[PDB]
Amino acid sequence: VAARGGELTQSTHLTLEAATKAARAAVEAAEKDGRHVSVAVVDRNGNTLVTLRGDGAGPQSYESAERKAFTAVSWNAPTSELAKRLAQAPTLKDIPGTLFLAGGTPVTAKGAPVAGIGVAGAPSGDLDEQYARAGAAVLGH
Amino acid sequence: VAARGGELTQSTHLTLEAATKAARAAVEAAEKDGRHVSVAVVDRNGNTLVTLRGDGAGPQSYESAERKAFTAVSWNAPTSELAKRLAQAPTLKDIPGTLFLAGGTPVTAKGAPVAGIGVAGAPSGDLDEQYARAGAAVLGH
Amino acid sequence: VAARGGELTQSTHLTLEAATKAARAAVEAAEKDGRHVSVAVVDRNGNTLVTLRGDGAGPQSYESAERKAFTAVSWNAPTSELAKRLAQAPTLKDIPGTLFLAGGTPVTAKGAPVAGIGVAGAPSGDLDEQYARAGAAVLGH
Amino acid sequence: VAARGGELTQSTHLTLEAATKAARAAVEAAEKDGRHVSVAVVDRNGNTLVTLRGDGAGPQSYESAERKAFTAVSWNAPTSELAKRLAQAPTLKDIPGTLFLAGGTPVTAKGAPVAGIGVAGAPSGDLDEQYARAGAAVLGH
Amino acid sequence: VAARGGELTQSTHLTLEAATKAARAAVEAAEKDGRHVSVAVVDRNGNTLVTLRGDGAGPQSYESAERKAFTAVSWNAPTSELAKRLAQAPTLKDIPGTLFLAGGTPVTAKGAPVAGIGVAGAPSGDLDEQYARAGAAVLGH
Amino acid sequence: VAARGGELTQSTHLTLEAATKAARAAVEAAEKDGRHVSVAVVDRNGNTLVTLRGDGAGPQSYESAERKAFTAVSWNAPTSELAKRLAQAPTLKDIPGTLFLAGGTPVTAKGAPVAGIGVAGAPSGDLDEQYARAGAAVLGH
Amino acid sequence: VAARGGELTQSTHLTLEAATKAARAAVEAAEKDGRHVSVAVVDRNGNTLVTLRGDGAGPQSYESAERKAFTAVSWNAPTSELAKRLAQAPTLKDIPGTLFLAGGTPVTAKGAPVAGIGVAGAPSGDLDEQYARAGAAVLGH
Amino acid sequence: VAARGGELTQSTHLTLEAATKAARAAVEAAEKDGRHVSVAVVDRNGNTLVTLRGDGAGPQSYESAERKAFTAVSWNAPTSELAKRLAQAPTLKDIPGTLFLAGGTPVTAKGAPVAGIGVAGAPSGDLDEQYARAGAAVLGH
Ligand SMILES: [Fe+3]
Ligand SMILES: [Fe+3]
Ligand SMILES: [Fe+3]
């Protein structure tokens, strides 16, 4: 049973290869400052595409990285930016699956969000997000 | 931050509109038979796209419909076909999120599975799947 | 083994047709504005009757629409109205299943709530509840 | 927002009154035999309406009686009857929420199922179901 | 294989008969004021012993009454009074299973708590705890 | 609000001291053979009272031992015996929280079950139940 | 398949013998004061290694202890210290698994955290952490 | 406060670097046959260390791979081997977290298991496990 074409629509995604590349770059940037993090890349659909649990990363950081990446891709903004939204709209954080805490950054294709990169377990979420941005940076270019 | 094109890939979906069309057709065919079903359309990725709870449908049927659709699109075959696999490999049913019980059917686009339609709560699963096929049949075309 | 009249009671609900009709128009009103949302219709009992996942809706928005619709019908108010109740009873949002965030609006039958319509994923929850109202408006009159 | 009448619909329930005294009857008929059970009454929609945890009942039996009652009303048959269906359709038991094991019995209103009574934690499920019938027997008559 | 005596210990509970009597009176206190609640009795150990779901009670109120009764018995105080603890200790509410919101009240036996009574879904939590207190008030005497 | 006398009832338990001694003996028994297990003592109510995760125990064994203990206490029988009930009543294992697998063994107080001892992750469940019985063997006495 | 040696890394843990010793000590440091607590010891990886439910401990306290111990080891600080971090970072508490509430205290080996000890159920969380420190105090020395 | 060294023990693990290498090798093996799989590496403790979701892999496969990795490392044997155990001990598959289905294969250091590699979503689990073995094979050497 085949659908075509007016009932079809398309979406754009990172390849696994790209997601892995970005994720490993986020680890590597954290490694470079003697930091131990977990990293997640979450699709815009968002299934998780990649997780990496770093050596000596805190046990909480795994799921925390996942949810940051989810939150970033959901609204196409850094979670550090998104946490500022809770001043006016404090129940945004009651939306299931979210974590409004610095360390997730969106990846876009022609403007539109396709993935989030989440990092957790550094001394602060601001440093987390710096490593997440380092992850995004190796794409494409 | 912007990936291009060697680290991007495309995937194909039903529109909400087509998913709703095929869903509501499946209800229609069930109601033609004086039966009360729940119907789910589930993406290949598979997020649920559409649920409809029939009037007077059993309370079990809602989730049952979803997992039938999920199972159909996961392996690109009717759940009645897939249920037959359990004789040789009984532990396939222990894969999370699956239900190996007639009433789920795949939709394809260009050969690849793009959605599953799942029906539950007719007096038996062979009837469920009959209405599932009827929903699929209103695509494309 | 059959029960008789005094120990039976009745309740009132949208038909599936009604709930589908309302949800689809809420999507229709969103896509008019270039907006990509998920819509849920949840019963007073509240099982979910309908979900629709709009093309290009954020992945968080599906569950979010659901809980809004649940929260609206639970208290027979807009969730935007209900969110302001948190100022002096802050632990209302600790009630399981609830999301106190604009985008849910109740549907009534002689004054008593029978359904909720939740929308999520527009630029603001205020816009969500506008499209939620536009869904409720096609009922029916 | 007010719906009128050709997209409203009606459904019939046991009153809480009626469900409570059916549940307490099932307990009392268990305690006739020095037997210590849990009882649940689940609606057709099926929310649970009543639970009672017997003095000295096994810790497993609370949730067990819930699921038996859900299962019985879902298919409008006693769970002892339903259990025997698994010879032909073994994956019926993979439907979420269900327990295909004697101790649940349906209550009807003009013919159509409106509640299930579930009992758990007697020496046998067959004895569970006898107490469950002794629950339903104080209706309506 | 049998423990005795000196590493056995005892604990004290409401009977099911007691707890049902308390639950139904809490309903019937709410019923007199035309209002539509769910009621739970939770043991000190705390398994739930009784739930009753009121006719036309909000779908939220079932779970919510449960957790109120859990919270009351956990600390041997009315939940309205436990909610005031949150000013100086805001993360008491992050303790799993708890709901810090008026409608739960302890029953004691010589001075130590043996069950909680939780009412939810009347127009204020402060009405809920009145009905919970009415539930406890039929014990003794 | 205090209840007296005859709407109270008692129940007998292991003390923590007892439950700990039993559990640590079970570990001791396993480690004597160079076996690495997890051990749980679950009450009759059954809350878990003690868990111990052995040095080098398989990651699965922790929850397994919990459920074996739960199952043994629930029906006042060794889970190895309980597993033989499945031939004639195969859906007993569909009862939530149970694990019908050798390694759980009941503790009694004048004849009535008060705790279960659960051991997992010896090379066989039969060996598990050996260590479970050895843990119970240091009780009372 | 054997990995060696540069794909391999080591980590340090409390033994079960040590973990039980520190947990038991926390218990009877609370029992010296006639207070009734749950104690949990969670590895840095963090699996739970030990739980003890104290005689007459509140039902909330079991899981409360677990998450305190988890929180403490995750950031290698007392949870009384950690809770103060919420003033300028309110959403730290939205990290899954965590409880930011006094009663959890880290154990280190060569400066690096290897376990957390969690106590819940005293009159206050500060008294919990006192007993938790008394647990940790029987190491190493 | 510092534990030392009698209270302390070591465990061996794959580095993240090693786990990623193996996971990517399993994918690359599958992609050579035109097969779209998910891969997971799970520690013996068993946290998941690495997940990769392959392009066009079935949605079920992600968690399936996770549980296969978990199951393999739990008993230090291929899951295809472990599935054969269910003939004699059929309730082994009722152990939480497990999937007794070909596609998981253990990795050892000095003969003791340190990780599992799980692959799901090829034409058969036997082929899954071939790709899993090819993942393991690039370690060490
Ligand atoms: Fe974190
Ligand atoms: Fe069904
Ligand atoms: Fe949303």
Ligand SMILES: [Fe+3]
């Ligand atoms: Fe049972």
Ligand SMILES: [Fe+3]
């Ligand atoms: Fe409520």
Ligand SMILES: [Fe+3]
């Ligand atoms: Fe095991």
Ligand SMILES: [Fe+3]
């Ligand atoms: Fe606590």
Ligand SMILES: [Fe+3]
């Ligand atoms: Fe699979």
